[PDB]
Amino acid sequence: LDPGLQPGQFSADEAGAQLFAQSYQSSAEQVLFQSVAASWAHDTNITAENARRQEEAALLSQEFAEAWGQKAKELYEPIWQQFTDPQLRRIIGAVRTLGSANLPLAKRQQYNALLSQMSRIYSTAKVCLPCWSLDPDLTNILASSRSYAMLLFAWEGWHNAAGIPLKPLYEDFTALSNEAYKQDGFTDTGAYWRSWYNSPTFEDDLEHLYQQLEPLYLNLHAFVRRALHRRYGDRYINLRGPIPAHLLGDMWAQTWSNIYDMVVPFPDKPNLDVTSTMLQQGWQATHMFRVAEEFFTSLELSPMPPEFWEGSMLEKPADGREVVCHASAWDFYNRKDFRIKQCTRVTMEQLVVVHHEMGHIQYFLQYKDLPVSLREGANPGFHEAIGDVLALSVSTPEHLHKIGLLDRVTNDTESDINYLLKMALDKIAFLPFGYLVDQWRWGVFSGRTPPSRYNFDWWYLRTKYQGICPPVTRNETHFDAGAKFHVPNVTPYIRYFVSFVLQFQFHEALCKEAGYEGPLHQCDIYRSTKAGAKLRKVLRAGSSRPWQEVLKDMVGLDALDAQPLLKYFQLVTQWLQEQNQQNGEVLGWPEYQWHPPLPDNYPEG
Ligand SMILES: *[C@@H]1O[C@H](CO[C@@H]2O[C@@H](C)[C@@H](O)[C@@H](O)[C@@H]2O)[C@@H](O[C@@H]2O[C@H](CO)[C@@H](O[C@@H]3O[C@H](CO)[C@@H](O)[C@H](O)[C@@H]3O)[C@H](O)[C@H]2NC(C)=O)[C@H](O)[C@H]1NC(C)=O
Ligand SMILES: C[C@H](CP(=O)(O)[C@H](Cc1ccccc1)NC(=O)[C@H](N)Cc1nnn[nH]1)C(=O)N[C@@H](C)C(N)=O
Ligand SMILES: *[C@@H]1O[C@H](CO[C@@H]2O[C@@H](C)[C@@H](O)[C@@H](O)[C@@H]2O)[C@@H](O)[C@H](O)[C@H]1NC(C)=O
Ligand SMILES: *[C@@H]1O[C@H](CO)[C@@H](O)[C@H](O)[C@H]1NC(C)=O
Ligand SMILES: [Cl-]
Ligand SMILES: [Zn+2]
């Protein structure tokens, strides 16, 4: 460690801790900057050399964390929890947790190489015709093909290509990760990940939310299954069984927006799939990001700085460059450089993703003057919810009209059902998936799911919660959890489930603050500077305060609450229930063992 980055000496008490923290933050930004930079260089240009540079940057970060980590424990270990300054306790508790820096050097090098290689496998995997990338090739197949056999080829090829080679590495990663966090006092890495919500009842609280939400999912599921049965027939769809996992428009069946075509209840009302209008009008990536930005500035939030426009990667490079295409928002921790890296495609769903990523950026801009340790969400679900809340307003038929994407205007019950059904295909269909991913990982980290049961337990949870089944046989050679980005990229998922509940709590409060007085699902906060100020207060707090109290200041309640989501969807919740009854549907999938047959031609599309 460079001498300037090393910790000096400090008194063993709170006034020393504060000087410690200032000295730390001074050196942290440089260490953060070089590792973010090196990750950026790699993820926008996947090369062995850039992987090497990133691993060295990560080793440097580990050196930094050990030095300051061990000094913090030398002076402050048995007194930091009684400090008067609550932000200083948060800062100190963070520095004192070493994580992977608890590993000896050799194992640090093993760990960093495992992360690099798992990331490279996921982001460079291809499906070859007897070759397609995940983004855009396989994604567009999953979204637009209605050929059972073709969808099957893409789904199987992707899961086999990404997952199978990842499994031995994921096993070794899990062991080293657990060894590292066990030395910070956590029983396993999952306990560490859950501690970020600072709630002793986290898992029970989540289960209680899901119980309130599940009936909405079960009714959407049965309604969509019926539509699928009309198109693919009784041989490929079982009306009392799980839905084959490749038929819902998305590689993970986690959002069903792309089959809106087949389920739209009132096709004579305005056509809410405005993707074609975007293409007819010549929308490109940069337009999408400029339209998102202007929503933020309409609220008197900040525009994207010039460094964002000059540095960001907003389209997949066409110059023969391997990149990580999975969207991300980047804080370089120098208070100046903030970027998005998205392989943006011209679709309405991608326009919502653009807002989601820009919501991350806006957070970074508002708290860039906090101590680096407090530059994060009040919890990770907050950070994930910011852009989604704004996109809730953007998605309304009235707002789409304002921005030229929906010429025809209506305000009637059929049009509302259409719109709420389309929104539910994104927000309701996602809830079981957002909930199950880290149930799987928590069981792996705890050891209840050994490698011998990685896929058995994944599909147990996929069937239990999502009511889907794999369309070809799977065994423990397959590692289908590894075919989802966040798993090999070692980044948690429960934040998205929390965000999907939170974002409707946020939406209700912002709409009220803007003075909006109609149905919650027709609120558009565009140009509400009062709504903007209320959101800005949340953004500026970073993690300086407990998320339960930031929440109460914003929405008037100190807990996650499903009621705003339920209120938003109430009309289509009622309607789907009626429709399923009148069709004599079975809610659920009591033929839990059922899987579809293979196409007679298979393999062939
Ligand atoms: C789409 O239409 C709905 C429904 O409009 C209502 O029903 C129609 C059949 C007509 O009879 C309308 O004249 C009637 O208002 C609109 O929702 C409604 O919005 C108004 C405000 O614009 C609400 O009235 C307010 O009620 C609050 C109490 O909550 C009072 O404090 C206010 O002073 C004001 O009178 C009305 O409650 C609301 N209805 C429902 C069921 O929420 C909606 O605005 C419209 N959408 C668009 C985009 O134009
Ligand atoms: C599109 C979105 C990408 P994201 O912005 O959430 C992305 C996922 C990710 C995580 C680690 C490394 C690389 C990427 N997260 C980020 O870019 C940010 N670092 C989020 C952040 N949160 N606090 N500071 N930053 C996403 O993954 N959504 C879920 C629902 C999904 N598509 O499965
Ligand atoms: C696991 O599966 C491997 C892949 O074979 C393909 O998938 C299996 C599940 C069957 O559907 C088979 O018809 C496919 O060819 C097999 O090579 C392997 O032997 C299977 N068993 C084990 C223990 O790995
Ligand atoms: C990609 O990385 C290589 C080093 O691995 C570098 O020489 C090259 O300039 C990079 N390409 C771009 C477009 O940055
Ligand atoms: Cl999380
Ligand atoms: Zn995000």
Author numbering: 1 to 130, 136 to 610
Which text from the study accompanies this structure?
Angiotensin-converting enzyme (ACE, EC 3.4.15.1) is a zinc metalloprotease which has traditionally been known for its role in blood pressure regulation via the renin–angiotensin–aldosterone system (RAAS). Although formed from a single polypeptide chain, this protein has two catalytically active extracellular domains, the N- and C-domain (nACE and cACE, respectively), which are separated by a short linker region. We, therefore, investigated whether the 33RE backbone contains a unique property which allows it to take advantage of this hinging behaviour of nACE by determining the mechanisms of action for a range of ACE inhibitors differing in their backbones and degrees of N-selectivity, namely: omapatrilat, enalaprilat, SG6 and ketoACE-13.
Previous kinetic studies reported that 33RE was a high-affinity inhibitor of nACE (Ki of 11.21 nM) and had ∼1000-fold selectivity over cACE with S′-nACE, S2-nACE and S2_S′-nACE mutations, respectively, leading to decreases in binding affinity of 22-, 254- and 900-fold. This shows that the S2 mutations have a greater effect than the S′ on 33RE affinity of nACE and that upon combining all eight mutations in S2_S′-nACE, a synergistic effect occurs so that the affinity for 33RE is similar to that seen for cACE. The zinc-binding group of 33RE is a phosphinic acid that replaces the P1 backbone carbonyl of a peptide and forms a bidentate interaction with the zinc ion as well as hydrogen bonds with Tyr501, His361 and His365. The P2 group of 33RE has a peptide-like backbone with the carbonyl having a hydrogen bond with Ala334. The 33RE P2 sidechain, a tetrazole, shows hydrophobic interactions with His365, and hydrogen bonds to two water molecules that are also bound by the Gly382 backbone nitrogen, Pro385 backbone carbonyl and Glu389 sidechain. The only significant difference in interactions is observed with the P2 group of 33RE, as a result of the Y369F mutation. In the wild-type 33RE structure, the hydroxyl group of Tyr369 interacts with the tetrazole side chain of 33RE, and this interaction is obviously removed by the mutation to phenylalanine.
